Ligand binder design. Sequence first.
Ligand code: CLA
Ligand code: KC2
Ligand SMILES: CC1=C(C#C/C(C)=C/C=C/C(C)=C/C=C/C=C(C)/C=C/C=C(\C)C#CC2=C(C)C[C@@H](O)CC2(C)C)C(C)(C)C[C@H](O)C1
Ligand SMILES: CC1=C(C#C/C(C)=C/C=C/C(C)=C/C=C/C=C(C)/C=C/C=C(\C)C#CC2=C(C)C[C@@H](O)CC2(C)C)C(C)(C)C[C@H](O)C1
Ligand SMILES: CC1=C(C#C/C(C)=C/C=C/C(C)=C/C=C/C=C(C)/C=C/C=C(C)/C=C/C2=C(C)CCCC2(C)C)C(C)(C)C[C@H](O)C1
Ligand SMILES: CC1=CCCC(C)(C)[C@H]1/C=C/C(C)=C/C=C/C(C)=C/C=C/C=C(C)/C=C/C=C(C)/C=C/C1=C(C)CCCC1(C)C
Ligand SMILES: CC1=CCCC(C)(C)[C@H]1/C=C/C(C)=C/C=C/C(C)=C/C=C/C=C(C)/C=C/C=C(C)/C=C/C1=C(C)CCCC1(C)C
Lengths: 99, 78, 150, 128, 168, 171
Amino acid sequence: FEISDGVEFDLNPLVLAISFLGWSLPGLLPSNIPLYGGKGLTTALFAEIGEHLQTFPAPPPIGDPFWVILFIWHSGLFATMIFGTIGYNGYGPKSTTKY
Amino acid sequence: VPQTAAWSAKTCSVMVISNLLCIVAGRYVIQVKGSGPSLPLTGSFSNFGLPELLATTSLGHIVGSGAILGLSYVGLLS
Amino acid sequence: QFVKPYNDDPFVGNLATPVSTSSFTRSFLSNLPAYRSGLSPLLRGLEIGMTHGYFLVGPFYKLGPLRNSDVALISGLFSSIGLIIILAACLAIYGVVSFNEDDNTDSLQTSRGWKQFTSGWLVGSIGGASFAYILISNIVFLQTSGLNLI
Amino acid sequence: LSMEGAGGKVATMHQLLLWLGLLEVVSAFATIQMFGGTSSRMPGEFGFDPLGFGKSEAAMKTYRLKEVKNGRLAMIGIGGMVHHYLLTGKGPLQFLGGIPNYKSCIEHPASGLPYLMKAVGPVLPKIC
Amino acid sequence: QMAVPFLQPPSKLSSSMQGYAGFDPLGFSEKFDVNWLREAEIKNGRVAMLGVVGLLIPEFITLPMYSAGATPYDSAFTVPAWALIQITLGCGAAEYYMHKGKMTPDNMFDGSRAPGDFGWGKADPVMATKEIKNGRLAMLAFGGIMHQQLITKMGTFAHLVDFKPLVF
Amino acid sequence: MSPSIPFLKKPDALDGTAAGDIGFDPLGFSSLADIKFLQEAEIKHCRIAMLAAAGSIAQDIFTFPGYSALTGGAKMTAAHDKLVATGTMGQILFWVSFAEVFGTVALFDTLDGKRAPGDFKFDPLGMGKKNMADMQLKEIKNGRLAMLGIAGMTHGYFISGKGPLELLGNF
Ligand code: CLA
Ligand code: KC2
Ligand SMILES: CC1=C(C#C/C(C)=C/C=C/C(C)=C/C=C/C=C(C)/C=C/C=C(\C)C#CC2=C(C)C[C@@H](O)CC2(C)C)C(C)(C)C[C@H](O)C1
Ligand SMILES: CC1=C(C#C/C(C)=C/C=C/C(C)=C/C=C/C=C(C)/C=C/C=C(\C)C#CC2=C(C)C[C@@H](O)CC2(C)C)C(C)(C)C[C@H](O)C1
Ligand SMILES: CC1=C(C#C/C(C)=C/C=C/C(C)=C/C=C/C=C(C)/C=C/C=C(C)/C=C/C2=C(C)CCCC2(C)C)C(C)(C)C[C@H](O)C1
Ligand SMILES: CC1=CCCC(C)(C)[C@H]1/C=C/C(C)=C/C=C/C(C)=C/C=C/C=C(C)/C=C/C=C(C)/C=C/C1=C(C)CCCC1(C)C
Ligand SMILES: CC1=CCCC(C)(C)[C@H]1/C=C/C(C)=C/C=C/C(C)=C/C=C/C=C(C)/C=C/C=C(C)/C=C/C1=C(C)CCCC1(C)C
């Protein structure tokens, strides 16, 4: 895989796995606030996914915690993904540039 | 409203430990040292200057205040 | 590192970037009908028109003047056919004006090549519009955009 | 298909479509390869010959001609059968039996493509 | 023999080091100073051994000047925090005096000092393996005992005479 | 060219050396992803699905003491639910994750090419020393069959509410 004309890029999915875990394991930190229920961010997202799969065709109504939980979780996940790819490719084992 | 406990041995211990932790860390993390003497210490603490001491104690006070308030919030300190 | 001169030519009005010169980009562009190798200009036009006349029926079907009527789908197909004819006319006039009669062996940049391309595009577009019309008229999920499952 | 709804018990036609559609997507890849010239597969060759009737090339040719001829005949015949059934509500063997069929026409449910019989009565004669 | 046989051997580690089983699956020794890691391991093990003993013995004997909590672990919160901060300061004095002021990775092992060697006694390889194995076991056991006392809210020996489930 | 599909051409990525390689890849996921990564994923699925199918059948036959009291007669995914509250599934998840950390390291090695996919060196009884190729082919075959088997068991349970063997006993 070439990220550009002649520049190669590893595209390791283990980076994706590690970033996902790095954001999700902290997300387990529970909160008693109504949005999370009693649970953490990742667990609340799983619970909402199941709850709104039970009612499949109908979308989670505006004001449901699902949208806020989804947005926050994916914001953090994408941030961790960017940081993880930066670390693996610039600070990793085969980087050339001193970053 | 959160709980902020009154001064106690626990608060003093938290503050002292935060200051000591930040002093040691400042030994490891402060890149440039100023130009002057050093407080009278040998070994690892052989370039500890007064400005570095003051900076580490300032950060230690910030961290101690934060930890005290947060532990009172979660109820652990109080 | 990732952005470089185009074709190692620093003075051409282009830059080699991930969007412009990545492996995925090159594979996708080289496998699209406009660039795939071996296709005749007619087959390129066939595939492209098939793909385009399909999406055309929907906007007309679901937002046209007769969209709240019982003839919405037929009206939509008809309006797609009209637009396809107009665009085929555009293609034909562009071909006759731009390409002179010299023979470059059907390279899609020739009079004959562009004539074949426009003929194939017309046929494929009308066929794709008709296929979309059939599928919409026969499948409820497409007539309701999924609001049959509600 | 009327019984194969979301709140339905049977899935006959959907099962048939599922399996034949797997077969058909694989055959689509095969015919793409044949069309591009990358593959040496010949038209209609799926490698299905358990009894080895067409192993011999001359036998393969005679059998290919027989298959295409009978396929054309069946293509005509099945269309005839379907249209006879739409007109008279009769299967092939019945329609064969009754000749003045339009006298003994049997009832038949709607096709599922009702508009295609629009002109049968207004424009066309409706001898029934 | 290698602890994890489906993973590349750790090159930094060696048999000469006490308690070498080839167990660096995640490659900490490749990213950090191995002398630092060894010294930290020995110190953590020593503190954890003393901590297991200090979690078990208070259940039986309580000092006169102090009041015992439900568990020895809770006694930490019950006792004056002046005591805890003074323990911290005494440990700091001990660290400074032991390391002769050489408390930082860049200077800690200067003078060709074996990790964990404070000059208290001579170093024997078998005794060192004993020490490190006991320290690792005591680290894990301190984790277990501390969490048992934390959750159960009962002393360890009482909880071994009862064996209630740990639930939260 | 492909043995599995006589009329389709052999997949380019599949060399035919790998266990269970009969040139079955009509859609072309081999080109999309590294073949070693896909092989590791396939073997992981094989093993977890084998355990899941054997567990479904064995849970139908017998239930460990005390687990029946906690579960309250629930079966298959219902049992999962009942036990999530207890934290049993929590222990299973924690320890499987702990194993999967070293699995992640092993997959780093595999993608680097140092390790063969699915090779954890776990042969305590040495049953695979004699005929490794035959054992690997058996693993892949039984794993595919067990993936489809657990799929069938779970979906029959979703349909009827019965268990793998209970449905066979009565419909
Ligand atoms: C073990 C010690 C300890 C403990 C137990 C706690 C515990 C706590 N701290 Mg913390 N704290 C500590 C140490 C500790 N602290 C230390 C050492 C410091 C010094 C640095 C602080 C400084 C600190 C501050 C300054 C504050 C807390 C607060 C809190 C409490 C609420 C935080 C919360 O849930 O916000 C959750 C909040 C969010 C998830 C929302 C954050 C979004 C903000 C509003 C905007 C940020 C957006 C940013 C600009 C853009 C994003 C980045 C971009 C690059 C994408 C929480 C009980 C807060 C508090 O007391 O509130 C009542 C508080 O304000 N702490
Ligand atoms: C790490 C070990 C350690 C060392 C090396 C050490 C050295 C010295 C020195 C040497 C220069 C002096 C002069 C001194 C003096 C006092 N120590 Mg101290 N001390 C250590 C440990 C503890 C603990 C655990 C406690 C404690 C206490 C007191 C009290 C309080 C008396 C009171 O109750 O009024 C006084 C006056 C107790 C306390 O603060 O109780 C509220 C208490 O529990 N100390 N201590
Ligand atoms: C390939 C293969 C194998 C195979 C095989 C198989 C399974 C082969 C199957 C072959 C079949 C099923 C052939 C069927 C042909 C039917 C025709 C020509 C029908 C014509 C109907 C007409 C004209 C009509 C009509 C009519 C009309 C219009 C209206 C009606 O009212 C009246 C009427 C009926 C007259 C085997 C197993 C040997 C193994 C080998 O190794 C591989
Ligand atoms: C690693 C290793 C070792 C090992 C090991 C181990 C523990 C190996 C374990 C292997 C296992 C558990 C293999 C399980 C295979 C299960 C299959 C194929 C299930 C098929 C189900 C089907 C077809 C079905 C079905 C069904 C469906 C769909 C619907 C139902 O209504 C009906 C029905 C039930 C019929 C040991 C410890 C020996 C050491 C050694 O040194 C190496
Ligand atoms: C299942 C289903 C349905 C269905 C259906 C089906 C299966 C419908 C099938 C329809 C078919 C097979 C129609 C065939 C028509 C063939 C014709 C007109 C041939 C003319 C040949 C000629 C003129 C040959 C001439 C010949 C030539 C060329 C050359 C010289 C010789 C000569 C004899 C002259 C529906 C529609 C009811 C809908 C329902 O919801 C679902
Ligand atoms: C870029 C991106 C990001 C997020 C994901 C996402 C998937 C949305 C993706 C975008 C995807 C897009 C833009 C997909 C659009 C797909 C389109 C327009 C597909 C069109 C398909 C066309 C089809 C079948 C046409 C079928 C036509 C047929 C038989 C015609 C047959 C016929 C012909 C040609 C002539 C004679 C008559 C007859 C026989 C009927
Ligand atoms: C109460 C109090 C008072 C004053 C100080 C402070 C405020 C900090 C506070 C003190 C807090 C303390 C002492 C906290 C210490 C926590 C500890 C020691 C926690 C320990 C956790 C242990 C854990 C996870 C162990 C997990 C180990 C695992 C899986 C091992 C796995 C395995 C490995 C590695 C190899 C062999 C096979 C096996 C067994 C599968």
